[PDB]
Write an enzyme that holds these catalytic residues in place. Structure first.
Site, PDB file in Angstrom:
ATOM      1  N   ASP A  37       0.755  -1.127  -0.060  1.00  0.00           N
ATOM      2  CA  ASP A  37       0.007   0.052   0.005  1.00  0.00           C
ATOM      3  C   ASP A  37       0.788   1.355  -0.022  1.00  0.00           C
ATOM      4  O   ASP A  37       1.926   1.253   0.393  1.00  0.00           O
ATOM      5  CB  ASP A  37      -0.833   0.031   1.154  1.00  0.00           C
ATOM      6  CG  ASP A  37      -2.085   0.674   0.965  1.00  0.00           C
ATOM      7  OD1 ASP A  37      -2.211   1.665   0.118  1.00  0.00           O
ATOM      8  OD2 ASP A  37      -3.090   0.899   1.834  1.00  0.00           O
ATOM      9  N   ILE A  56      -6.094   0.903  11.678  1.00  0.00           N
ATOM     10  CA  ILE A  56      -5.430  -0.195  12.756  1.00  0.00           C
ATOM     11  C   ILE A  56      -4.767   0.503  13.782  1.00  0.00           C
ATOM     12  O   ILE A  56      -4.246   1.517  13.742  1.00  0.00           O
ATOM     13  CB  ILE A  56      -4.713  -1.169  11.714  1.00  0.00           C
ATOM     14  CG1 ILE A  56      -4.039  -2.267  12.285  1.00  0.00           C
ATOM     15  CG2 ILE A  56      -3.205  -0.288  11.072  1.00  0.00           C
ATOM     16  CD1 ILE A  56      -5.219  -3.313  12.894  1.00  0.00           C
ATOM     17  N   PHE A  99       5.726   0.635   8.031  1.00  0.00           N
ATOM     18  CA  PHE A  99       5.258   1.908   7.501  1.00  0.00           C
ATOM     19  C   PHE A  99       6.101   2.940   7.205  1.00  0.00           C
ATOM     20  O   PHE A  99       6.727   3.084   8.169  1.00  0.00           O
ATOM     21  CB  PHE A  99       3.954   2.248   8.284  1.00  0.00           C
ATOM     22  CG  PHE A  99       2.813   1.362   8.266  1.00  0.00           C
ATOM     23  CD1 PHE A  99       2.781   0.274   9.213  1.00  0.00           C
ATOM     24  CD2 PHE A  99       1.847   1.444   7.479  1.00  0.00           C
ATOM     25  CE1 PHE A  99       1.563  -0.542   9.003  1.00  0.00           C
ATOM     26  CE2 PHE A  99       0.614   0.636   7.291  1.00  0.00           C
ATOM     27  CZ  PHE A  99       0.478  -0.421   8.226  1.00  0.00           C
TER      28      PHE A  99
END
Lengths: 107, 375, 384, 820
Positions: A37, A56, A99
């Site tokens: 993503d 999340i 991330f």
């Protein structure tokens, strides 16, 4: 659980507290380096209200720790990630997420 | 209540507009006349702007009208369990059928022009396979009555109008070399499913107007919803008209083909199945007489139900005439050894008492003169 | 047992009789009423006979003693073998007309349906067993009807295929145990060349027509293809060949096949396993009805995709099942999906497997969201 | 490696093209749950770049364009396409502004045609529902099949449409240059994917008016002017591209059609107001005409004594000028309608030079030119071409095929129309998917939202026009067909469809009649459909025919013979579900028996009167198939029906034979009660099949024959025993608690009231001795018990209401007809 590894320091003073949208350009990656993503491909920042549990939980707790304009990294363990069920069709169950968080602005 | 029902000016604007659209289309658009079929087929039949090319190949790539017929004969020949409805085929088969016919001392000179122009209209179609595609969808329907068969037989009649000799030759050749049984299996199936007069359905229809129910949207005066006795009368009329058109002109080659098929694996006697339908019709009309035997006068609905049944019986007798004229000795021995006589006796018995009953008053002159031309 | 069974029952190969006279010369002579002639079934190769225990039954060619098997034709039931004529014969009996009666030449018994109707016929489809009775009923006259060349030719291959492959089946499982070692053969030599020749004759006998054929004529070959496949499946040979795959699949390799059959059969093991799948794919392809039989043994074919001896043959069989029966797609579970995906894992990037998955999603234009989610649940997230 | 290398590595090109075909497969037919997931693998940037990637190969370029359409556009496009055939035009100020031709000065009757698809469209179309695809958002807390349906993944469409215009302009110029290396490797791969994307955006209505003007310029820059540059129609394009061109033109033809429909609807809005005003003024003038008229007022006021449906027929009945005497509309109103009837024909090219000058002549000229240029080999192209050619010539007939779906509504109900059409789109979108628990819950709540919408009741004509009753029917047909023998799955959804259809019939007569045409289909689907509990498909059939004497007469015997043969089977074994649940097996099913009987009861009884034709057909089928009566009154081996009712009383009272004995299931079948309910429905059927007294006093042959048959089949001696049977009473005791019986497993007053009609209609009461003889034995203690239960504590019990209906609906009226 969630630990931050700063890539580019921000201002260090303005932190998004409870009650305001968190605007962020995130780049999620799997544990094997296969990116799953991003948001700059969509060219629109990911605006989510803080504390409303709309994201999340790992991303939720990570987004509070850093400040404005701080490029950072987050190692989302399966405990605070989708975990047991994963994301159906995208994320395999029981996987670590990485991330490239970038909190660009606050409103 | 009619004194106190809502007048038009008190109706809501949207509701009034909804009724207005139906009134407008039913009184201005359905009645509107626009015969574009002739110029459609004229446009489709011109292979213009490449005649100057003068292509070396003999092939001579089909003009647009021929391409429709080829495409429909492909859908006709494709192998499918059911021949599904095709509103495109309804549209174009109807256009082709309505583009051919185009129809007190008128002389024998201009009639030689009119019939030759009709032959030109039919030649514009049958030179492009239009006879074969009609035969194909008749076989392809597999005995299922519907708008497929009704528009196919409508086209087959319009292409066979006046007993076109070359069209009958083309159809006979196509049946004789293809050697398929499904064509006559279908024709037998449709002829068996053709309906006759039903007294039970008629009695229910009689009680329908006795109630005379109306609708919510305003009020309809004696609504003329679907009549359920001889509903397929037009379809039986033009099925036998198509069969008559095939053998018209003393085509003994085709008359012997209906009685028996040497090429086909099994032979289906269409002449016998025609008699069997005539027998069913005669039993129905006889019972319909027996229900009006007591009554001195025949009401309007009864008169219409006779006129529809009698017109169909007229068509059946005309087709039976065409099966044996020429004369065809095979069909003459077939009818002699058939069950035609019982239907003949029954009709004669119906004719007698019906003429005496209808001669008692001047309100059934129409029915009685149709009786005269039928007998 | 013979039954006056109606409907679509006698569009099949089980209901063909052959008018076989006694005379060796001019046996194809035109029928003269009341002449001695046998009646035979085509696929089973058995002759109607008046047996002492079960009355009218079909018996093999080794017990057709011309006494109980011979019959005759006539016009009516009133009481009436003639000298043979060396010629074609006068035209007596026509097709579709000229009602005929059959009486046993010696016993004199006449054909007639059995009167009693049991509980089976009370609810189930009507079948009235014809009993060769003393006089019987009135409407027991017969219409004689033709059958076309293709199915008439077909019936013998049912008889030949059943005889040869059944003899291969019993010759195969005869060495189910008793490993070879180095000794003499377990049974008679297997009909390998006969079977291989029959296989290659049948694969081309069921070969789909070429694409370049004109659509006006191509569909005619499609009709013959469906009719032939339907008759062959209907005679149970689709299950009989399934037995052939089941019997061969128990051996893991050609060497293991040599351990129970011999070195002579291990050479043709890989050939026959591919040919049987080709024949099966030819039999099943294009027919919805013949394809519908694979609803129950779906896992049977699924279990064989792992086998390396014939990979594309079984994969093609599975593809033919999927593109034809939409009901099969409702039966596929997660186990089957993981099995199919394992082929991409084990056999490389076989693009045809993607077509199998592409067919498992939509069949006849309807979505199957259960299979769509299982495919995406197991294939997409791994990114491997 | 660079993806452009696959133009040489043909090994991986086939595999990757098939991979994109699998992506379209797993996101095909509205599966937006997975269509969201695919956005991770194929990013928006990847798709957008691949749009402009001029060196991509053929299959990969077309696969990526189709993948973009499938993922982001097809789900919304399909639903919008299904609503492109309906025209719900609201009466709004912008609706009024719609005119047939643009305002100009070349010609009032026939101005040059406006640009198709350019202007304002007021026809109602539900808005699209997209969602920004985010894979890290929190998973829904609710359980499976409870969250709302996933929407189509979002994608910038304002920029996407501009990009789509841009490559199309590039392709038009490049095609004109006759370059030896077209984009994608071939002309087909250069034009087909782009034209697919343009067509999909056009159908979705992304393009604005200026954008449409551009697309019309690239299609034909000369004819479509408003007042190399070579159009797409003059470039010698292959067959595959021609199909997409046909799709574009048929879209513009639909836009022209919708413009015609909206123009006509606006004319209706402008015309009804004047016609209402004139008819109102003429009402007052008719009121004052009594001072200057005579007894002939009736002829002119018959218009106002006639409801408005035939009023507009008379008012507008002046087309052929031979019928101007009855019409009271002044010449200005008459001229107005004749004016709009002429420009409408001109707008359809009826009546009124190489320049086509319009889309009507352009499409016909182009299609004819394509057909005569070469033998077209694509069947789809051939069908598309002549579908277009038929539509251009048959301008009026094409309008005729569209008018029954047109409908005008008040502006106050547009938001409810949107809230209804979205649910309808859900139902239509679920026709193309195998039914599952997720889809089941997605449509039961959709139907429930249809129920609570006022437009569903206010506009039954509109509801029939949209054909909801069909889409629900095929949904039920599909679920009944799936597992048609082994098990009818999804009972909660079958009863949702059936309940909706049953409520649909009760709205109005026309809807009821529409359902009556589907009667024949329902019987065989209800042959095994009775296994489920609740609103069975049979109840839809019964509700379709009830209270309509016309429909009851129109019902045919071949429909009834199915029912009686089904009862024949139902009379020789038990219910298969009851067999599976462990019920004590009995040689005849009472559940399906009573379910058939109530339908026959509704079939042969209308508005208090029996239907003679239906009654005689059903009774001759029951006698022809005697097994339908059950164990008692069967004939051979079957004793009287009294011998059955007490036997059922014992079975119902005794456990381990009443049922499986493991309501407990809220619909638990008690076989002891089921036997005696079955026979109660049987006697109710016989009583409603009884010929009327007016026919008996007229002495009709079959009326006497049939009623004598009823007498012989039903002996009166056992009948009085049924009358004389007692009731189980709620008795005061056990610390004051109301010790009541269970109506689901006990004698009920309904069963006796089912008999009172029979006795009152078959044998009758003529003499006092037989009157008092039956009244004192059984009809007396029932009402003495009613008097005892009629107290301050027991008159509201479950039996007391039944007793009140039992007596006041069957017993006391009977006494009123037996009073002398």
């Amino acid at each position: 659980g969630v630990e931050i590894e700063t890539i580019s320091p921000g201002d260090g003073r303005t932190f998004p507290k409870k009650g305001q949208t968190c605007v962020v350009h995130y780049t999620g990656m799997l544990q094997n380096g296969k990116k799953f993503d991003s948001s700059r491909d969509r060219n629109k920042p990911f605006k989510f209200r803080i504390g409303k549990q709309e994201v999340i939980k790992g991303f939720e707790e990570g987004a509070a720790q850093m400040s404005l304009g701080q490029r950072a990294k987050l190692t989302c363990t399966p405990d605070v990630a989708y975990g047991a069920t994963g994301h159906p069709g995208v994320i395999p169950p029981n996987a670590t997420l990485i991330f490239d968080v970038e909190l660009l602005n606050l409103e | 209540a009619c004194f106190r029902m809502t007048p038009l000016y008190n109706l809501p604007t949207h509701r009034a507009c909804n009724m207005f659209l139906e009134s407008y289309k039913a009184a201005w658009i359905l009645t509107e006349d626009h015969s574009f079929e002739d110029r459609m087929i004229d446009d489709l039949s011109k292979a213009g702007e490449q005649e100057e090319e003068e292509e070396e190949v003999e092939e001579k790539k089909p003009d647009p009208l021929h391409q429709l017929v080829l495409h429909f004969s492909r859908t006709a020949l494709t192998e499918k369990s059911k021949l599904d409805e095709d509103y495109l085929y309804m549209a174009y088969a109807d256009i082709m059928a309505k583009s051919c016919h185009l129809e007190v001392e008128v002389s024998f000179e201009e009639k030689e022009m009119e019939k030759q122009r009709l032959l030109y209209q039919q030649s514009r179609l049958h030179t492009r396979g239009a006879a074969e595609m009609v035969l194909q969808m008749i076989s392809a329907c597999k005995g299922e009555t519907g708008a497929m068969v009704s528009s196919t037989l409508k086209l087959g009649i319009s292409i066979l109008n006046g007993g076109n000799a070359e069209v009958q030759q083309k159809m006979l050749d196509y049946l004789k070399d293809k050697k398929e049984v499904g064509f006559f299996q279908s024709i037998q199936a449709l002829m068996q499913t053709c309906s006759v007069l039903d007294l039970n359905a008629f009695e229910r229809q009689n009680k329908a107007e006795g109630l005379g129910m109306v609708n919510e949207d305003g009020t309809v005066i004696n609504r003329q919803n679907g009549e359920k006795v001889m509903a397929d009368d037009e379809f039986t009329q033009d099925l036998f008209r198509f069969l008559q058109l095939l053998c018209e002109g003393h085509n003994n080659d085709f008359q012997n083909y209906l009685r028996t098929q040497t090429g086909n694996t099994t032979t289906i006697n269409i002449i016998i199945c025609t008699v069997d339908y005539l027998l069913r019709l005669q039993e129905s009309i006889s019972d319909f007489y027996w229900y009006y035997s007591g009554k001195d006068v025949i009401e309007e609905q009864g008169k219409r139900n006779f006129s529809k049944a009698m017109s169909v019986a007229k068509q059946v007798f005309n087709s039976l005439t065409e099966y044996i004229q020429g004369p065809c000795t095979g069909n003459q021995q077939s009818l002699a050894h058939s069950r035609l006589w019982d239907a003949v006796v029954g009709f004669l018995h119906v004719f007698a008492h019906m003429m005496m009953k209808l001669a008692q008053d001047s309100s059934q002159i129409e029915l009685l003169k149709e009786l005269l031309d039928l007998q | 047992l013979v039954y006056y069974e109606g409907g679509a029952v006698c569009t099949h190969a089980r209901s063909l009789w052959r008018l076989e006279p006694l005379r060796i010369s001019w046996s194809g002579s035109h029928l003269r009423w009341g002449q001695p002639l046998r009646i035979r079934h085509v696929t089973t190769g058995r002759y109607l006979a008046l047996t002492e225990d079960q009355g009218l039954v079909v018996v093999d060619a080794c017990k057709a003693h011309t006494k109980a098997t011979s019959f005759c034709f006539r016009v009516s039931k009133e009481k009436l073998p003639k000298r043979d004529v060396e010629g074609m014969g006068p035209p007596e009996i026509k097709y579709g007309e000229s009602l005929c009666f059959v009486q046993h030449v010696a016993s004199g018994l006449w054909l007639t349906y059995a009167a009693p109707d049991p509980k089976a016929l009370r609810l189930g489809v009507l079948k009235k067993k014809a009993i060769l009775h003393q006089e019987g009923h009135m409407d027991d006259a017969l219409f004689l009807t033709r059958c076309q060349q293709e199915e008439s030719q077909a019936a013998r291959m049912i008889h030949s295929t059943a005889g040869l492959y059944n003899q291969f089946i019993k010759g195969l499982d005869s060495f189910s145990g008793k490993p070879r070692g180095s000794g003499p053969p377990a049974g008679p030599a297997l009909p390998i060349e006969a079977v291989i020749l029959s296989l290659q004759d049948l694969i081309g006998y069921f070969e789909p027509p070429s694409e370049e054929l004109q659509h006006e004529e191509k569909q005619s070959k499609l009709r013959s293809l469906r009719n032939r496949q339907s008759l062959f499946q209907e005679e149970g040979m689709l299950s009989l060949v399934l037995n052939c795959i089941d019997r061969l699949n128990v051996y893991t390799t050609a060497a293991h096949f040599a351990e129970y059959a011999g070195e002579e059969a291990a050479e043709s093991w890989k050939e026959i396993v591919n040919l049987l799948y080709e024949l099966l794919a030819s039999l099943i392809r294009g027919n919805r009805a013949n394809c519908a039989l694979f609803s129950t043994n779906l896992d049977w074919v699924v279990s064989k995709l792992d086998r390396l001896e014939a990979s594309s043959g079984i994969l093609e069989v599975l593809y033919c099942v999927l593109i034809e029966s939409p009901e099969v797609l409702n039966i596929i579970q997660e186990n089957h999906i993981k099995s199919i995906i394992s082929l991409l894992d084990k056999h490389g990037r076989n693009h045809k497997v993607l077509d199998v998955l592409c067919s498992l999603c939509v069949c006849n234009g309807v979505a199957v969201r259960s299979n769509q989610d299982l495919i995406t649940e197991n294939l997409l997230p791994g990114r491997e | 490696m660079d993806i452009l290398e696959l133009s040489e590595r043909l090994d991986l090109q086939r595999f990757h093209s098939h991979t994109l075909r699998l992506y379209r497969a797993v996101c095909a037919l509205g599966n937006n749950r997975v269509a969201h997931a695919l956005c991770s693998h194929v990013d928006q940037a990847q798709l957008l770049h691949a749009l402009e990637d001029a060196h991509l190969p053929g299959p990969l370029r077309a696969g990526y364009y189709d993948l973009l359409i499938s993922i982001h556009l097809e789900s919304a496009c399909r639903s919008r396409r299904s609503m492109l055939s309906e025209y719900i035009v609201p009466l709004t100020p912008e609706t009024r502004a719609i005119t047939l031709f643009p305002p100009g000065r070349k010609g009032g009757n026939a101005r040059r045609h406006g640009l198709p698809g350019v202007g304002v469209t007021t026809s109602l179309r539900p808005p699209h529902h997209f969602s920004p695809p985010c894979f890290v958002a929190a998973l829904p807390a609710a359980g499976v099949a409870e969250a709302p349906a996933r929407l189509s993944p979002a994608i910038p469409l304002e920029a996407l449409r501009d990009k789509a215009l841009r490559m199309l302009g590039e392709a038009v110029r490049d095609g004109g240059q006759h370059a030896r290396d077209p984009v994608g490797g071939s002309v087909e791969f250069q034009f087909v994917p782009v034209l697919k994307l343009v067509s999909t955006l056009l159908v979705m209505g992304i393009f604005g008016d200026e954008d449409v003007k551009q697309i019309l310029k690239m299609i034909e820059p000369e004819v479509f002017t408003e007042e190399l540059e070579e159009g797409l129609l003059q470039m010698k394009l292959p067959e595959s591209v021609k199909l997409q061109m046909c799709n574009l033109l048929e879209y513009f033809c639909d836009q022209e059609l919708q413009h015609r429909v909206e123009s006509l609807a606006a004319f209706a809005e402008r015309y009804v107001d004047k016609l209402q005003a004139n008819q109102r003024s003429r009402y007052a003038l008719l009121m004052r005409a009594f001072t200057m008229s005579a007894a002939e007022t009736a002829r002119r006021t018959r218009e106002f004594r006639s409801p408005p449906q035939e009023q507009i027929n008379m008012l507008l009945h002046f087309k052929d000028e031979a019928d101007e005497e009855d019409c009271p509309l002044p010449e200005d109103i008459r001229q107005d309608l004749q004016d709009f009837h002429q420009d409408l024909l001109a707008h359809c090219g009826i009546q009124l030079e190489k320049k086509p000058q319009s889309l009507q002549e352009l499409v016909s000229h182009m299609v004819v030119r394509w057909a005569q240029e070469d033998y077209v080999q694509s069947p789809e192209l051939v069908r598309a071409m002549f579908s277009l050619l038929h539509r251009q010539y048959d301008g009026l007939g094409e309008l005729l095929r569209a008018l029954p779906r047109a409908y005008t509504i008040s502006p106050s109900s547009v938001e409810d129309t949107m809230s209804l059409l979205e649910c309808l789109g859900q139902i239509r979108s679920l026709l193309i998917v195998q039914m599952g628990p997720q889809e089941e819950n997605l449509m039961i709540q959709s139907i429930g939202n249809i129920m609570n919408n006022k437009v569903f009741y206010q506009h039954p004509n509109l509801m029939r026009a949209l054909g909801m009753h069909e889409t629900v029917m095929e949904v039920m047909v599909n679920v009944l067909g799936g597992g048609e023998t082994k098990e009818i799955r999804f009972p909660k959804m079958v009863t949702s469809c059936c309940r909706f259809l049953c409520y649909f019939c009760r709205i109005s007569r026309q809807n009821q009649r529409s359902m009556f045409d589907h009667l024949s289909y329902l019987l065989e689907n209800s042959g095994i459909g009775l296994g489920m509990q609740g609103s069975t498909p049979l109840d839809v059939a019964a509700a379709s025919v009830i209270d309509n004497n016309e429909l009851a007469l129109a019902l045919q015997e071949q429909d009834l013979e199915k029912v009686v043969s089904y009862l024949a089977g139902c009379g020789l074994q038990s219910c298969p579900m009851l067999l599976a649940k462990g019920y004590p097996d009995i040689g005849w099913n009472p559940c399906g028996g009573e379910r058939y009987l109530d339908f026959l009861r509704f079939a042969v009884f209308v508005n208090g009167e029996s239907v003679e034709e239906n009654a005689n057909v059903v009774v001759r089928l029951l006698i022809r198939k005697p097994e339908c009566f059950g164990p008692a009154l069967r004939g051979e081996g079957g004793s009287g029906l009294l011998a059955a009712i007490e036997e059922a009383i014992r079975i119902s009272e005794d456990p381990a034979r009443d049922g499986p004995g493991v309501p407990p299931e809220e619909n638990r079948v008690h076989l002891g009660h089921a036997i005696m309910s079955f026979y109660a429905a049987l006697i109710d059927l016989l009583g409603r099949c009884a010929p009327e007294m007016h026919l008996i006093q007229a002495g009709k042959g079959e009326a006497l024959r049939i009623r004598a048959i009823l007498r012989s089949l039903v002996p009166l001696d056992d009948l009085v025993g049924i009358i004389s049977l007692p009731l189980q009473i709620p008795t005061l005791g056990k610390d004051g608690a109301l010790v009541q019986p269970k109506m689901s497993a006990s004698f009920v007053p309904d069963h006796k009231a089912s008999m009172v009609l029979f006795l009152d209609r078959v044998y009758g009461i003529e003499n006092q001795d037989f009157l008092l003889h039956v009244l004192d034995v059984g009809f007396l203690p029932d009402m003495r018990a009613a008097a005892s239960l009629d107290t301050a504590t027991f008159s509201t019990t479950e039996m007391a209401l039944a007793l009140n209906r039992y007596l006041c609906l069957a017993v006391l009226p009977l006494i009123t007809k037996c009073a002398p």
